[PDB]
Enzyme design. Structure first.
Site, PDB file in Angstrom:
ATOM      1  N   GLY A  77       3.916   1.170   7.892  1.00 27.88           N
ATOM      2  CA  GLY A  77       4.880   0.535   7.006  1.00 27.88           C
ATOM      3  C   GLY A  77       4.636  -0.949   7.113  1.00 27.88           C
ATOM      4  O   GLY A  77       4.387  -1.457   8.213  1.00 27.88           O
TER       5      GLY A  77
ATOM      6  N   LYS B 139       1.710   7.155  10.272  1.00 30.67           N
ATOM      7  CA  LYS B 139       2.132   6.594   8.987  1.00 30.67           C
ATOM      8  C   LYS B 139       2.585   5.157   9.232  1.00 30.67           C
ATOM      9  O   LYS B 139       3.438   4.907  10.095  1.00 30.67           O
ATOM     10  CB  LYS B 139       3.275   7.407   8.358  1.00 30.67           C
ATOM     11  CG  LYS B 139       3.791   6.838   7.017  1.00 30.67           C
ATOM     12  CD  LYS B 139       2.783   7.095   5.878  1.00 30.67           C
ATOM     13  CE  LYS B 139       2.960   6.132   4.698  1.00 30.67           C
ATOM     14  NZ  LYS B 139       2.407   4.760   5.009  1.00 30.67           N
TER      15      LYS B 139
ATOM     16  N   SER C  53       7.332   1.624   4.441  1.00 33.45           N
ATOM     17  CA  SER C  53       6.703   2.821   3.977  1.00 33.45           C
ATOM     18  C   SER C  53       6.751   4.035   4.985  1.00 33.45           C
ATOM     19  O   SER C  53       6.289   5.071   4.647  1.00 33.45           O
ATOM     20  CB  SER C  53       5.288   2.571   3.388  1.00 33.45           C
ATOM     21  OG  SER C  53       5.258   1.752   2.270  1.00 33.45           O
TER      22      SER C  53
HETATM   23  C1  LIG Z   1       5.012   0.423   2.343  1.00 33.75           C
HETATM   24  O1  LIG Z   1       5.160  -0.121   3.647  1.00 33.75           O
HETATM   25  C2  LIG Z   1       4.480  -0.333   1.305  1.00 33.75           C
HETATM   26  N1  LIG Z   1       4.499  -1.767   1.271  1.00 33.75           N
HETATM   27  C3  LIG Z   1       4.982  -2.438   0.278  1.00 33.75           C
HETATM   28  O2  LIG Z   1       5.328  -1.656  -0.738  1.00 33.75           O
HETATM   29  C4  LIG Z   1       5.245  -3.993   0.328  1.00 33.75           C
HETATM   30  N2  LIG Z   1       5.822  -4.809  -0.555  1.00 33.75           N
HETATM   31  O3  LIG Z   1       6.582  -4.253  -1.549  1.00 33.75           O
HETATM   32  C5  LIG Z   1       7.977  -4.481  -1.273  1.00 33.75           C
HETATM   33  C6  LIG Z   1       4.371  -4.829   1.220  1.00 33.75           C
HETATM   34  C7  LIG Z   1       4.587  -5.995   1.813  1.00 33.75           C
HETATM   35  C8  LIG Z   1       3.472  -6.319   2.478  1.00 33.75           C
HETATM   36  C9  LIG Z   1       2.541  -5.388   2.271  1.00 33.75           C
HETATM   37  O4  LIG Z   1       3.090  -4.441   1.458  1.00 33.75           O
HETATM   38  C10 LIG Z   1       3.015   0.094   1.294  1.00 33.75           C
HETATM   39  N3  LIG Z   1       2.575   0.392   2.657  1.00 33.75           N
HETATM   40  C11 LIG Z   1       1.685  -0.255   3.415  1.00 33.75           C
HETATM   41  C12 LIG Z   1       1.502   0.360   4.797  1.00 33.75           C
HETATM   42  O5  LIG Z   1       1.036  -0.283   5.690  1.00 33.75           O
HETATM   43  O6  LIG Z   1       1.844   1.526   4.983  1.00 33.75           O
HETATM   44  C13 LIG Z   1       0.969  -1.396   3.024  1.00 33.75           C
HETATM   45  C14 LIG Z   1      -0.001  -1.978   4.099  1.00 33.75           C
HETATM   46  O7  LIG Z   1      -0.832  -3.070   4.036  1.00 33.75           O
HETATM   47  C15 LIG Z   1      -1.583  -3.237   5.206  1.00 33.75           C
HETATM   48  N4  LIG Z   1      -2.263  -2.209   5.737  1.00 33.75           N
HETATM   49  O8  LIG Z   1      -1.614  -4.351   5.742  1.00 33.75           O
HETATM   50  C16 LIG Z   1       1.151  -2.076   1.655  1.00 33.75           C
HETATM   51  S1  LIG Z   1       1.899  -0.984   0.358  1.00 33.75           S
END
Ligand SMILES: *C(=O)[C@@H](NC(=O)/C(=N\OC)c1ccco1)[C@@H]1NC(C(=O)O)=C(COC(N)=O)CS1
Length: 261
Positions: free
Chosen positions: A206, A204, A42
């Site tokens: 990810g 930010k 992300s």
């Molecule tokens: C972006 O990093 C995005 N994550 C996802 O979309 C994920 N899976 O879809 C392929 C995923 C895997 C594990 C968790 O999400 C979003 N961002 C974030 C971020 O940290 O920016 C999260 C975070 O969760 C936390 N804070 O532990 C999930 S959605």
């Protein structure tokens, strides 16, 4: 010695860790696997919002975007709440940064437009900032080692530096981006956890499969001296279901903070 400490953390968390802090007036660049590729996850959403801001007049933030059931394909804490009314470009930028909203990011990509649902134009934006390294290839919702959808700690740090501390954006657009990152809700246990409370942190995050946990930040000392901090990690050794480990990033940030304070 930082490299021994970073290596120690890699063994603790069965992880690969990447760190970059650009040089300043009085500090040399901090680098550990800084030129190796790591999935964006992300973290691309920060430069994405910069691209959208740059591309349009500021009043474009007030343009309403409608979307439906089939647009909700990924973690989208805000966009799922507003599917019945739509969301403005400004609201989408807010969600993409502060809640790492997946749908919001996809809609912003679609707003930027062009081939690959906006991924090509997004990559073009990075190229315009002198980043020949990063690439975005797909949308939300990548095996370890695969080069698709990757950046390096070094490349993403230099991009964030330009966006927040340099002149990639005019001040008014720059402040919108900086404010959203300042008010991020997802980063409390990462870079923020490693720096003392009297340091300002904007970031930010990810997160992904294969234990992927990233955080890119700009931090300010108690006396207003800024530093750019990029920390990326994966845990390929645990496979697809390896848990991302925020504490790895908190510890890495603590080691960095110890050098910078
Ligand atoms: C972006 O990093 C995005 N994550 C996802 O979309 C994920 N899976 O879809 C392929 C995923 C895997 C594990 C968790 O999400 C979003 N961002 C974030 C971020 O940290 O920016 C999260 C975070 O969760 C936390 N804070 O532990 C999930 S959605």
């Amino acid at each position: 010695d930082l490299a021994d400490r970073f290596a120690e953390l890699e063994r603790r968390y069965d992880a690969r860790l990447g760190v970059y802090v650009p040089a300043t007036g009085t500090t040399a660049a901090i680098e550990y696997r800084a030129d190796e590729r790591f999935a964006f996850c992300s973290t691309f959403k920060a430069p994405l919002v910069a691209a959208v801001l740059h591309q349009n007049p500021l009043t474009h933030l007030d343009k309403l975007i409608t979307y439906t059931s089939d647009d909700i394909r990924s973690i989208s804490p805000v966009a799922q709440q507003h599917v019945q009314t739509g969301m403005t470009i400004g609201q989408l930028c807010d969600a993409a940064i502060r809640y790492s909203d997946g749908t919001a990011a996809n809609l912003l990509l679609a707003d930027l437009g062009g081939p690959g649902g906006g991924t090509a134009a997004f990559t073009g934006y990075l190229r315009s900032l002198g980043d020949t390294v990063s690439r975005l290839d797909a949308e939300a919702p990548d095996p370890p080692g695969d080069e698709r959808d990757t950046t390096t700690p070094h490349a993403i740090a230099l991009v964030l530096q330009q966006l927040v501390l340099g002149n990639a954006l005019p001040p008014d657009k720059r402040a919108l981006l900086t404010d959203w990152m300042a008010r991020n809700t997802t980063g409390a246990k990462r870079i923020r956890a490693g720096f003392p409370a009297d340091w300002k942190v904007i970031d930010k995050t990810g997160t992904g499969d294969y234990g992927r946990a990233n955080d890119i930040a700009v931090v300010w000392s108690p006396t207003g001296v800024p530093y750019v901090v990029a920390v990326m990690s994966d845990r390929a050794g645990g496979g697809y279901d390896a848990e991302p480990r925020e504490a790895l990033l908190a510890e890495a940030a603590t080691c960095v903070a110890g050098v910078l304070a």
